[PDB]
Amino acid sequence: KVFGRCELAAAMKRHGLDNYRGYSLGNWVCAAKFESNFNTQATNRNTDGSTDYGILQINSRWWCNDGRTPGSRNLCNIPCSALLSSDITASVNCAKKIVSDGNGMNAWVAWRNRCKGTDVQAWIRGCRL
């Protein structure tokens, strides 16, 4: 699904991502913009032999089961392809969890240096929530 600016943000708010682990919604929009450029089908090869799944580019290495990786954890208790689905609830529902270890949104590479130290409200500005 090709997600708009106005479309994905609104949903992450309804998805219960709004200021989750305090992180403002504008981060969540931006990370979705930086990790997949609003693609929910987007999946990428991790060099370590794992794969990136979901709009959140959530890594299959120890989060999910993709049926190709020996040494994978599956904490999410969901198949990887459920991360690629047009309903936002499966990617978001494991993103809370990626933050629920208490290791931060620093599990994402894009929000890591590319989306910090920037205007947070500029994504959301001019769209309604």
From Swiss-Prot:
Localization: Secreted
Keyword Secreted applies: yes
Keyword Secreted appears in the UniProt entry: yes
Cystine residue pairs: 6-127, 30-115, 64-80, 76-94
Keywords for this protein: Allergen, Antimicrobial, Bacteriolytic enzyme, Disulfide bond, Glycosidase, Hydrolase, Secreted, Signal
GO biological process, one term: defense response to Gram-positive bacterium
Tissues expressing this chain: In the egg white and polymorphonuclear leukocytes.
Active site per the UniProt annotation: 35, 52
InterPro entries the record matches: Glyco_hydro_22 (IPR001916), Glyco_hydro_22_CS (IPR019799), Glyco_hydro_22_lys (IPR000974), Lysozyme-like_dom_sf (IPR023346)
Binding locations of substrate: 101
Primary location group: secreted
Every C-type lysozyme domain range: 1-129
GO terms for MF: beta-N-acetylglucosaminidase activity; identical protein binding; lysozyme activity
SMART domains, sorted: LYZ1 (SM00263)
E.C. number(s) listed in UniProt: 3.2.1.17
Gene3D superfamilies named among the record's database cross-references: 1.10.530.10
Substrates-to-products reaction catalysed: Hydrolysis of (1->4)-beta-linkages between N-acetylmuramic acid and N-acetyl-D-glucosamine residues in a peptidoglycan and between N-acetyl-D-glucosamine residues in chitodextrins
GO CC entries: cytoplasm; endoplasmic reticulum; extracellular space
Family: Belongs to the glycosyl hydrolase 22 family.
Subunit details: Monomer.
Other noteworthy facts: Lysozyme C is capable of both hydrolysis and transglycosylation; it also shows a slight esterase activity. It acts rapidly on both peptide-substituted and unsubstituted peptidoglycan, and slowly on chitin oligosaccharides.
Physiological role: Lysozymes have primarily a bacteriolytic function; those in tissues and body fluids are associated with the monocyte-macrophage system and enhance the activity of immunoagents. Has bacteriolytic activity against M.luteus.
UniProt name for this protein: Lysozyme C
Organism listed in the record: Gallus gallus (Chicken)
